Amino acid sequence: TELSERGEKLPAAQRRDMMWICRDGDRAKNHLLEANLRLVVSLAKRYTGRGMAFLDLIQEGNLGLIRAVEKFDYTKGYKFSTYATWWI
DNA sequence: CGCCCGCTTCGGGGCAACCCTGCGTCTAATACAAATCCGGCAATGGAGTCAAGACCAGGTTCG
């Protein structure tokens, strides 16, 4: 982003492997989301019985999980599920 | 003389359209910012109001 202005000229190998890292991060993000979808279902399974549909509850839990993997930190050394349960 | 192979015929399955043998309570807040109501003076400025007071015009009374 700070390179897209006239910050620096683009070397070929540096450009292509920084593109590889930038594309790899999104695949890792999607991998984490696709991992914890089951936790989302296991949390949403008990808020039924009033008003909304079960798939709607699951989808809003998915959106909360996207927010949780946005604002998740690992240097506190805790498991992901205890942090994401709150946001879901 | 026997034999394949699609054509027709019925069966069974599959599916589309209607009723009741149908018809649960759930963490719990804080922090903050923006929007909005609203309560109360604080400039009015135009619109209504009272009162005087003048304006003659033609009955009405008097000479």
UniProtKB/Swiss-Prot annotation:
Region (Sigma-70 factor domain-2): 32-88
Motif Interaction with polymerase core subunit RpoC positions after renumbering to this chain: 56-59
Annotated TM spans: none
Subcellular location: Cytoplasm
Family stated for the protein in its record: Belongs to the sigma-70 factor family. RpoD/SigA subfamily.
Domain writeup: The sigma-70 factor domain-2 mediates sequence-specific interaction with the -10 element in promoter DNA, and plays an important role in melting the double-stranded DNA and the formation of the transcription bubble. The sigma-70 factor domain-2 mediates interaction with the RNA polymerase subunits RpoB and RpoC.
Subunit structure, as described in the record: Interacts transiently with the RNA polymerase catalytic core formed by RpoA, RpoB, RpoC and RpoZ (2 alpha, 1 beta, 1 beta' and 1 omega subunit) to form the RNA polymerase holoenzyme that can initiate transcription.
Its job: Sigma factors are initiation factors that promote the attachment of RNA polymerase to specific initiation sites and are then released. This sigma factor is the primary sigma factor during exponential growth.
Record protein name field: RNA polymerase sigma factor SigA
Organism this protein belongs to: Mycobacterium tuberculosis (strain CDC 1551 / Oshkosh)
Gene (UniProt): sigA
